[PDB]
Amino acid sequence: WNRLEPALAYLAPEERAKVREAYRFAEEAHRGQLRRSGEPYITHPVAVAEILAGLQMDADTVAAGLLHDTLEDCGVAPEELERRFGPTVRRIVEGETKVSKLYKLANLEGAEDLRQMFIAMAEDVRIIIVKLADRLHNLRTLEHMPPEKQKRIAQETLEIYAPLAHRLGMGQLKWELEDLSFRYLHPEAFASLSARIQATQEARERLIQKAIHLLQETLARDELLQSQLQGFEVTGRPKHLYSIWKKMEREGKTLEQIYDLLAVRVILDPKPAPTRESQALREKQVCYHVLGLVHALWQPIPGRVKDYIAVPKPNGYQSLHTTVIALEGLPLEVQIRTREMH
Ligand SMILES: [Cl-]
Numbered sequence: 001w002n003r004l005e006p007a008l009a010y011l012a013p014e015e016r017a018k019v020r021e022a023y024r025f026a027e028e029a030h031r032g033q034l035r036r037s038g039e040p041y042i043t044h045p046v047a048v049a050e051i052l053a054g055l056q057m058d059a060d061t062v063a064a065g066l067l068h069d070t071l072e073d074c075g076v077a078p079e080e081l082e083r084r085f086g087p088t089v090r091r092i093v094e095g096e097t098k099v100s101k102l103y104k105l106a107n108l109e110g111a112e113d114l115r116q117m118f119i120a121m122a123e124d125v126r127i128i129i130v131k132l133a134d135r136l137h138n139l140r141t142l143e144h145m146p147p148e149k150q151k152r153i154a155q156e157t158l159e160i161y162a163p164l165a166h167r168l169g170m171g172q173l174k175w176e177l178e179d180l181s182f183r184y185l186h187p188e189a190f191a192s193l194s195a196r197i198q199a200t201q202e203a204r205e206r207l208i209q210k211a212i213h214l215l216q217e218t219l220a221r222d223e224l225l226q227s228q229l230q231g232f233e234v235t236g237r238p239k240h241l242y243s244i245w246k247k248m249e250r251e252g253k254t255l256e257q258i259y260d261l262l263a264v265r266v267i268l269d270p271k272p273a274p275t276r277e278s279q280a281l282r283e284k285q286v287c288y289h290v291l292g293l294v295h296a297l298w299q300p301i302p303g304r305v306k307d308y309i310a311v312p313k314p315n316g317y318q319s320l321h322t323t324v325i326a327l328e329g330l331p332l333e334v335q336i337r338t339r340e341m342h
């Protein structure tokens, strides 16, 4: 509990009390039970609640994360969970993923039934996230599984869960799900690619960190930018090992051909705006402002500005790109985007 409690800071005291009541209930239902690792079962729903609390999930969602296995793993409490934690917690813990039927919106344009549509959908999204948080944690703790069972769940994850994560637009979940699945599915391919990156990545890492520090300090020191900004993040390339190995087979490319240009990402969280439009305006103003700061810092390579804010990819991808001449006279790609954008 002392590990979970700090992550629940974003919730109102009464919302946190519901989560403690849920933890203390799971603590009872899972009393005596053990995982594959000799660890007590309660550690699993806690870790799942931690994943959800890190994502700043709804109070009922975090609570439902502590109770998601009180029906499956140990005991039956369908009317008990409704009696103790409400119907919405009971609904999430019961499984109702239904199916992707967004194409039904397009054909059906035509209230209390359209109001309930939102509350049913948002409840249906919450079900998927808990399943995802659960699966992500299991994969993390997959070292205590026979090497066959390990391969059956990595494939299920790649067929079912990583695509569900994609539907929900949870790229950070999808990334980790794919890469942990890759590790256990083809370990020999994983260890070959991992150690190969740990050769180029260490040499690159010195420059990437110099660049990171230079961009982070340049942005924090700009007065006007920080005024319309809540915060920012300057990272190196993300390194999606499954989507990197996936591309090597498709494109018939070497890994040396992928890392053929040092890259840096700038994720900007702007200050909140009263209306939806004054937010979209703020969201873009900030991005070109960074492009200017970047071009003032490092020399821009002619015709390497890729504006995907103005011309988004068919999947809706927005971001500003520019290849510059940075440290040691090297072509460095910069990608400027907000938290909302991908
Ligand atoms: Cl600020």
Ligand SMILES: [Mn+2]
Pocket (backbone or CB within 6 Å): 044, 068, 069, 134
């Ligand atoms: Mn579970």
